[PDB]
Amino acid sequence: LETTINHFFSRSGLVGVVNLTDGGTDTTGYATWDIDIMGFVQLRRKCEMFTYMRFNAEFTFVTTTKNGEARPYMLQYMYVPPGAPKPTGRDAFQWQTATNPSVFVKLTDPPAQVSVPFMSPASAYQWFYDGYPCPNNMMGTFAVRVVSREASQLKLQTRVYMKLKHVRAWVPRPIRSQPYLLKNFPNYDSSKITNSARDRSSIKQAN
Amino acid sequence: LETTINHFFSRSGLVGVVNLTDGGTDTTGYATWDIDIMGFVQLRRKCEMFTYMRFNAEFTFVTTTKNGEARPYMLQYMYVPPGAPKPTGRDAFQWQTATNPSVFVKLTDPPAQVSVPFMSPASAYQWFYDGYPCPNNMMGTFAVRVVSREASQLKLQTRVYMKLKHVRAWVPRPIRSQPYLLKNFPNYDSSKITNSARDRSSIKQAN
Amino acid sequence: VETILEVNNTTEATGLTRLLIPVSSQNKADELCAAFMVDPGRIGPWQSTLVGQICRYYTQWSGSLKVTFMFTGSFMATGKMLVAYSPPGSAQPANRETAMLGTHVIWDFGLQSSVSLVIPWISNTAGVVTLWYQTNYVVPPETPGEAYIIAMGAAQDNFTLKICKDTDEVT
Amino acid sequence: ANIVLAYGEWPEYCPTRPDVSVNRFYTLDSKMWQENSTGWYWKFPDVLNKTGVFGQNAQFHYLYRSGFCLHVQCNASKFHQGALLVAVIPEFVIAGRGSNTKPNEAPHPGFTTTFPGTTGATFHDPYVLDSGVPLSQALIYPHQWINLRTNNCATVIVPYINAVPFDSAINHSNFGLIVIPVSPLKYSSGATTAIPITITIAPLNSEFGGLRQ
Amino acid sequence: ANIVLAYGEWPEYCPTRPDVSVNRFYTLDSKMWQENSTGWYWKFPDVLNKTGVFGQNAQFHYLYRSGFCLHVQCNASKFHQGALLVAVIPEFVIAGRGSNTKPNEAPHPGFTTTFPGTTGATFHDPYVLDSGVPLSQALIYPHQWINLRTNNCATVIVPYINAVPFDSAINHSNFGLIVIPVSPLKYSSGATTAIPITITIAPLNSEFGGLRQ
Amino acid sequence: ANIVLAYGEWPEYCPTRPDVSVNRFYTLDSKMWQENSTGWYWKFPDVLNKTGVFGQNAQFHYLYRSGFCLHVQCNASKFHQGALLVAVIPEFVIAGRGSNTKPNEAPHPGFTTTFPGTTGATFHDPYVLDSGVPLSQALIYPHQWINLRTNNCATVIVPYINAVPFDSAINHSNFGLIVIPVSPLKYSSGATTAIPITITIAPLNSEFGGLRQ
Incomplete structure (x- = not known):
């Protein structure tokens, strides 16, 4: 039962890590993180085993401070859907928009948790698109800010844990053995090609 | 009703105690504790009364500070299944793995509580294995770390309380009367053998 | 799904020729040609197949396997070979008579050109598949006396996997 | 001969249908396979974008959907030896x-x-x-x-x-x-x-579908 | 004689079955019990790993499953006295x-x-x-x-x-x-x-089961 | 293939019967036939007295009775020529x-x-x-x-x-x-x-029959 796709993918791993400063002259405050599931090599190798995929996602935000102690401070997470403009500053108008859903949660509360459905104009996500427009499948954004009035003087460090749900896959393909070089390109190295089987002494042994 | 095995074993005793420093040059932070149920003599004497056993476990982590006051700090408990590698440092990659399940909980929250099922490749656990490969039955690991960014300067002291559940036993054997010398070996002392009945004056009395 | 094992994984080999077992007519009547292990989740020839990459994500496995050979050579060249499974326990066999007392299939080149041997019951030594020169590699005039044999391998309906775990091919 | 049906599904319909002059055996030129050859690959729906009626009706349109029936012959003498792997x-x-x-x-x-x-x-x-x-x-x-x-x-x-x-x-x-x-x-x-x-x-x-004159 | 059936279960089947030459009464050598003796113990499935057909078919195989029928005689005269405890x-x-x-x-x-x-x-x-x-x-x-x-x-x-x-x-x-x-x-x-x-x-x-020649 | 049944009689029974591990295709090593070769002969019930389970159960016994199913392959190219006579x-x-x-x-x-x-x-x-x-x-x-x-x-x-x-x-x-x-x-x-x-x-x-341990 633990060999199906729904158990091969559905497990709350760690996708991303977002920093935040909220300082003085560099009064950024916000921290946008374009969300793609190809961050860490493990999930990319498990997701490039297939050609087409379709899934919902559960997102869990676990926010700590620099040292680690957490004081009660309001935080706004904001999901910018595909096509909507990203926020530019801490207090721009793209923060008070009603289309962009927000989650208001304190630091002392349990970690935040939302769910994002299938949001592609095609019938399924495709990672290998042979042609000309990388494809145009996207999931959105997750800009986060400290809700306050007087500038907060702390630097947080959020973690974004993703779990896939209701996963369906199509057109299996072999597993990438060569190392990675870029994010959105399967570029390998021409020289120094690593063999898929470690060498042994001779062909008439069992090493 | 309180003489069955399910009431003879199912009671949340104390199995282990784990320390933690999270300091400077000895920046360990993590604290791994290989989990075996033969820690304290009482449970070992109650579990070596039988030859084969089969049970689920409930694990409760009660974490305090050195003095005892508890401030809100995020903590990660991580269950390393049998066969998976243990974490080596505080921020190694074995902490961001998706296979190893984790529990994120603060100090001010109620104590953590998880459940581990029967995880042996055989049909039941055996404590007495007459032969050559101690056997190869194992339960896993429970590495714990302070989730932070800037090093926490506190030293905690976790307690691991285990409760057995759905216990089944087979092939009863007599109760060990001699003292213990090792953990994984029933080595007794050749000299100074303690008698299983205290001495009295004569054989024709009732002392 | 059948998948070409990398049985020739020794050194001094280029990229593709690691997938081929060389058979020649210079080798003597009775001699060893090629031998390999069975364990798919082990550093060796089974690291290049697909079952050897999937059985790395899981920490326990069971069930039978199937190793199928295929002879790429001339049409006019015949000869016999002895494929031989030796179960776990003792080490690799030494002579052809010790191998033919274990599990063995006599595969010739005249009629059959692709033999298949089913390996029973293997789990987390693990078994040894040997491949011996039975008689010779005869070849008529004006024909190259050097051919290749591709080894392929897959699981069976009994193959069951347990305990999920992240792999270690990546860093 | 033995036919390997790809993914167990026959190419079916769901737009114009030529059905006459495009269902013909387009034959590509032969590739000379030698000792030190490496291999060959063909991207399909732009192999036939320059050849006749299918190229005309595939360049002047905007939407496209079809399957394919492939045939790969490799005729050598009974004294040559080797093996090819043909895969889509x-x-x-x-x-x-x-x-x-x-x-x-x-x-x-x-x-x-x-x-x-x-x-x-x-x-x-x-x-x-x-x-x-x-x-x-x-x-x-x-x-x-x-x-x-x-x-x-x-x-x-x-x-x-x-x-x-x-x-x-x-x-x-x-x-x-x-x-x-x-x-x-x-x-x-x-x-x-x-x-x-x-x-x-x-x-x-x-x-x-959608042909732009 | 009175037979004590161990744990109330008969040895049953579940692999080859010899059924002829291994179901015979293997008789071990007699132990000399004396005044100052202490006791004896025998590990069973390696007592018969050197004796005849059962030893041959237990060394050359890899999997094994069987029960046992034990018999312990101790014949002394009617003037000797003592007691033994025989237990598996x-x-x-x-x-x-x-x-x-x-x-x-x-x-x-x-x-x-x-x-x-x-x-x-x-x-x-x-x-x-x-x-x-x-x-x-x-x-x-x-x-x-x-x-x-x-x-x-x-x-x-x-x-x-x-x-x-x-x-x-x-x-x-x-x-x-x-x-x-x-x-x-x-x-x-x-x-x-x-x-x-x-x-x-x-x-x-x-x-x-699983015999390695 | 065409099977020549020797003397028109099938090998039949008449003692233990292995019936499992001895009815397998024992494959001898190949003989290199050349221009100036002369021939080869094999004495049968002592060809397999050193090979595995049949050798073990034929050396440790005293009485023996069996038939045989032979198979002689000789695979040469379509340009070689010659003839062999195989006879029991x-x-x-x-x-x-x-x-x-x-x-x-x-x-x-x-x-x-x-x-x-x-x-x-x-x-x-x-x-x-x-x-x-x-x-x-x-x-x-x-x-x-x-x-x-x-x-x-x-x-x-x-x-x-x-x-x-x-x-x-x-x-x-x-x-x-x-x-x-x-x-x-x-x-x-x-x-x-x-x-x-x-x-x-x-x-x-x-x-x-009659096995001496």
Whole structure:
């Protein structure tokens, strides 16, 4: 039962890590993180085993401070859907928009948790698109800010844990053995090609 | 009703105690504790009364500070299944793995509580294995770390309380009367053998 | 799904020729040609197949396997070979008579050109598949006396996997 | 002959239907396979964008949907020896060969390498399929072995594999063909030093839409 | 005679079945029981790994499953007196005798002590069964009393007791036999100073698997 | 293929019966047949006295009775030419080569010549079958022609031919096999100079008796 796709993918791993400063002259405050599931090599190798995929996602935000102690401070997470403009500053108008859903949660509360459905104009996500427009499948954004009035003087460090749900896959393909070089390109190295089987002494042994 | 095995074993005793420093040059932070149920003599004497056993476990982590006051700090408990590698440092990659399940909980929250099922490749656990490969039955690991960014300067002291559940036993054997010398070996002392009945004056009395 | 094992994984080999077992007519009547292990989740020839990459994500496995050979050579060249499974326990066999007392299939080149041997019951030594020169590699005039044999391998309906775990091919 | 039906699905309909002049055996030129050859690949829906009625009705339209019936002959004498692996690959993305991690300094394949045309293109590293993926498990795709001592022909009926039921036939090559000489060619002196490989394709169940005059 | 059926289960099947030459009464050599004797124990599935067809078919195989029918005779004259306790013990692990708590400095039993073979081995401290466990409650196992004024025979039909239905018969002794002279041997002068003890075992329902030539 | 049933009788029973691990295709090593070769012969019930379970159950027993299913492959290219004669001979007694009429001065074949083992032995005078008997009428036995332009295989199902229904499998070779290149091997330069000959035998209907541990 633990060999199906729904158990091969559905497990709350760690996708991303977002920093935040909220300082003085560099009064950024916000921290946008374009969300793609190809961050860490493990999930990319498990997701490039297939050609087409379709899934919902559960997102869990676990926010700590620099040292680690957490004081009660309001935080706004904001999901910018595909096509909507990203926020530019801490207090721009793209923060008070009603289309962009927000989650208001304190630091002392349990970690935040939302769910994002299938949001592609095609019938399924495709990672290998042979042609000309990388494809145009996207999931959105997750800009986060400290809700306050007087500038907060702390630097947080959020973690974004993703779990896939209701996963369906199509057109299996072999597993990438060569190392990675870029994010959105399967570029390998021409020289120094690593063999898929470690060498042994001779062909008439069992090493 | 309180003489069955399910009431003879199912009671949340104390199995282990784990320390933690999270300091400077000895920046360990993590604290791994290989989990075996033969820690304290009482449970070992109650579990070596039988030859084969089969049970689920409930694990409760009660974490305090050195003095005892508890401030809100995020903590990660991580269950390393049998066969998976243990974490080596505080921020190694074995902490961001998706296979190893984790529990994120603060100090001010109620104590953590998880459940581990029967995880042996055989049909039941055996404590007495007459032969050559101690056997190869194992339960896993429970590495714990302070989730932070800037090093926490506190030293905690976790307690691991285990409760057995759905216990089944087979092939009863007599109760060990001699003292213990090792953990994984029933080595007794050749000299100074303690008698299983205290001495009295004569054989024709009732002392 | 059948998948070409990398049985020739020794050194001094280029990229593709690691997938081929060389058979020649210079080798003597009775001699060893090629031998390999069975364990798919082990550093060796089974690291290049697909079952050897999937059985790395899981920490326990069971069930039978199937190793199928295929002879790429001339049409006019015949000869016999002895494929031989030796179960776990003792080490690799030494002579052809010790191998033919274990599990063995006599595969010739005249009629059959692709033999298949089913390996029973293997789990987390693990078994040894040997491949011996039975008689010779005869070849008529004006024909190259050097051919290749591709080894392929897959699981069976009994193959069951347990305990999920992240792999270690990546860093 | 034995037909390997790709993914167990027949190419079916769902737009004009020519049904007369496009369901004919388009025969590509033969490739000369030699000792030191590496392999060949063909991006399909732009192989036939320059050949006759199918090219005319695929360039002047905007939407496209069809399957294919492939046929790969490789006729050699009874004294040659070797083996080919013919396999279709859905969404066969050619990777770039380099060791650069910067965006506009890393190499990328050109237009002639990604879309070879009606003359095909050869591999550079056939051990990694020019995509960083080892070919040893490339048998996960629909495939056949052309073994030069058992048969000389292969055939693949491949349906329409795409996420959108209609797509442009010019800016998106659906799937590719890859022939690879796993076992090299060997022959005694005095024989023909090169073996021809012939490919004929039939566009089963073609559908075209939105034609711009 | 009275038969004590171990744990109320008959040895049953679940692999080859000899059924002819291994279901015979293998008779071990007699042990000379004397005044100052201590006891004897036998690890069973490696007692018969050197004796004939069962040893051949248990060494050349890899998987093993069988029960046993034991028979322990102890024939003494009507003027001798004493008592024996014969008991089977599943997973009889011999402990080491010492007072060291360090891992590689604490004592451990050798290969000849853990696996005695077809000649058995004697105890050192029969009061603790050489396992730190008192023998007074060793009657929790299947057992009989050989009392030299009531009977001279004992028999134990013991089934297969293991967590895995197949296991190696060379690196894992399933269960052991232990004969212990609880009441010592006494006799007037002029009688036979030693009493023989004879053990015959029958491997009921043997099953072997995975034979490596 | 065409099977020549020896003497029109199937090997039948009449003692233990293994029926599992001895009814498998024992494959002997291939013999390199060349231009100047002479022939080969094999004494059967002592070919398999050193190979695995059949050798174990034939050395440790005293009575023996079985038939055999033979298979002789000889795979050559379509440019080689020649012919073999494969024939079984009941009670194939090797004669000695000499010209002496005195009892203890006349030559006699050694143990390695009469019982070759699992590696066979070659003839010295194939025209007289090394027995003073001309091979031209050796077609009186069960036999086949392995002609290298029609087939490459032969098979002989041979029953038990003996005057006593049980006999020792160590001191009495029942019957022998003889392959003889009647027409020599011919090939043009550049071809494989030696042709392999492979023999696989199956002990149909084996019966063993009187086993001495």
